[PDB]
Design an enzyme around this catalytic site. Structure first.
Site, PDB file in Angstrom:
ATOM      1  N   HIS A  40      20.894 -12.815   5.914  1.00 20.70           N
ATOM      2  CA  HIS A  40      21.961 -13.582   6.613  1.00 20.70           C
ATOM      3  C   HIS A  40      23.027 -12.004   7.541  1.00 20.70           C
ATOM      4  O   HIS A  40      23.722 -12.370   8.323  1.00 20.70           O
ATOM      5  CB  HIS A  40      23.420 -13.476   5.896  1.00 20.70           C
ATOM      6  CG  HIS A  40      24.046 -12.363   5.153  1.00 20.70           C
ATOM      7  ND1 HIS A  40      23.384 -11.532   4.183  1.00 20.70           N
ATOM      8  CD2 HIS A  40      25.012 -12.029   5.316  1.00 20.70           C
ATOM      9  CE1 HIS A  40      24.150 -10.457   3.521  1.00 20.70           C
ATOM     10  NE2 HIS A  40      25.354 -10.866   4.597  1.00 20.70           N
ATOM     11  N   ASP A  84      17.668 -13.947   0.451  1.00 22.43           N
ATOM     12  CA  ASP A  84      17.991 -13.285   2.048  1.00 22.43           C
ATOM     13  C   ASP A  84      17.780 -11.568   2.248  1.00 22.43           C
ATOM     14  O   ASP A  84      18.032 -10.511   2.055  1.00 22.43           O
ATOM     15  CB  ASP A  84      19.803 -13.080   1.352  1.00 22.43           C
ATOM     16  CG  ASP A  84      20.725 -12.276   2.540  1.00 22.43           C
ATOM     17  OD1 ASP A  84      20.198 -12.800   3.251  1.00 22.43           O
ATOM     18  OD2 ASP A  84      21.978 -12.107   1.703  1.00 22.43           O
ATOM     19  N   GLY A 175      29.911  -5.307   5.538  1.00 21.19           N
ATOM     20  CA  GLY A 175      29.611  -4.547   6.014  1.00 21.19           C
ATOM     21  C   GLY A 175      28.287  -3.411   6.283  1.00 21.19           C
ATOM     22  O   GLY A 175      27.858  -3.255   6.327  1.00 21.19           O
ATOM     23  N   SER A 177      26.292  -5.734   4.191  1.00 24.65           N
ATOM     24  CA  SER A 177      25.043  -6.092   3.958  1.00 24.65           C
ATOM     25  C   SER A 177      23.579  -5.793   4.803  1.00 24.65           C
ATOM     26  O   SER A 177      23.911  -5.292   5.244  1.00 24.65           O
ATOM     27  CB  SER A 177      25.537  -7.586   4.724  1.00 24.65           C
ATOM     28  OG  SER A 177      26.513  -8.357   3.959  1.00 24.65           O
ATOM     29  N   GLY A 178      22.947  -6.090   4.366  1.00 24.34           N
ATOM     30  CA  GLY A 178      21.382  -5.283   4.482  1.00 24.34           C
ATOM     31  C   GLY A 178      21.052  -4.108   4.564  1.00 24.34           C
ATOM     32  O   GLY A 178      19.563  -3.824   4.374  1.00 24.34           O
TER      33      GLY A 178
HETATM   34 CA   LIG Z   1      29.323  -8.986   5.809  1.00 26.24          CA
END
Ligand SMILES: [Ca+2]
Ligand SMILES: [Ca+2]
Length: 223
Positions: A40, A84, A175, A177-178
């Site tokens: 995502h 994800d 922020g 994320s990943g």
């Molecule tokens: Ca995010």
């Protein structure tokens, strides 16, 4: 990262800032040419920022390498955030050093209770919005599958795990994320999702990287 701490410059050498004119997501360097991140977090025109501490000032250890190719997981479902995970290939190999290092893929899946290091430049505030410029870290245990399922009923797949605290206050956030979840020096998770940030009974949900080591490895092997 809410409730975390300032990692210290380049103490998380595999931490990646995915930059598309701005830091929008974290990533984990897994070899000289490949970053794993949350699917995502996928965008076109990704520049992979390595050796980042303060993402807003150039401190000398940065390596800015644009993404040659992005490979969102084949079974990535943006609705449920199942699978994800995404592979990002750098245009050129990162220059690996003490501060731009790859993170090892997990041979085994980390168990509940294993303390993990979550890191990112995400929002540090559960309520409101404060984005740190320097890397924030959070030491957080992997929660049990039952606790993860009970926290997010009907939402946790076998490809997810929860880490953090059911009383909240400490969590990856928007922020992050990943970004990596590293346990025992291995990339066990990817900051994937969560109902808000650092809320009670809403721990962070992380991509279970142990399930994708095959897919990651085969994908690295032919891309
Ligand atoms: Ca995010
Ligand atoms: Ca910087």
């Amino acid at each position: 990262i809410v409730g975390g701490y300032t990692c210290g410059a380049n103490t998380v050498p595999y931490q990646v800032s995915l930059n598309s004119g701005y830091h929008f997501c974290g990533g984990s360097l897994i070899n000289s040419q490949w970053v794993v991140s949350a699917a995502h977090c996928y965008k076109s025109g990704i520049q992979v920022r390595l050796g980042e501490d303060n993402i807003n000032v150039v401190e000398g250890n940065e390596q800015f390498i644009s993404a040659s190719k992005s490979i969102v997981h084949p079974s990535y479902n943006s609705n449920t955030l199942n699978n994800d995970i995404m592979l990002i290939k750098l245009k050129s190999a990162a220059s690996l050093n003490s501060r731009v290092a790859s993170i090892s893929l997990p041979t085994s899946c980390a168990s509940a209770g294993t303390q993990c290091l979550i890191s990112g430049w995400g929002n540090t505030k559960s309520s409101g919005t404060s984005y740190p410029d320097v890397l924030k870290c959070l030491k957080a245990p992997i929660l049990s599958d039952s606790s993860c399922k009970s926290a997010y009923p009907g939402q946790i797949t076998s490809n997810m795990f929860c880490a953090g605290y059911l009383e909240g206050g400490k969590d990856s956030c928007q922020g992050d994320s990943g970004g990596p979840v590293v346990c025992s020096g291995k990339l066990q998770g990817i900051v994937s999702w969560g109902s808000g940030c650092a809320q009670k009974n809403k721990p962070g949900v992380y991509t279970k990287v142990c399930n994708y080591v095959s897919w990651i490895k085969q994908t690295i092997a032919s891309n």
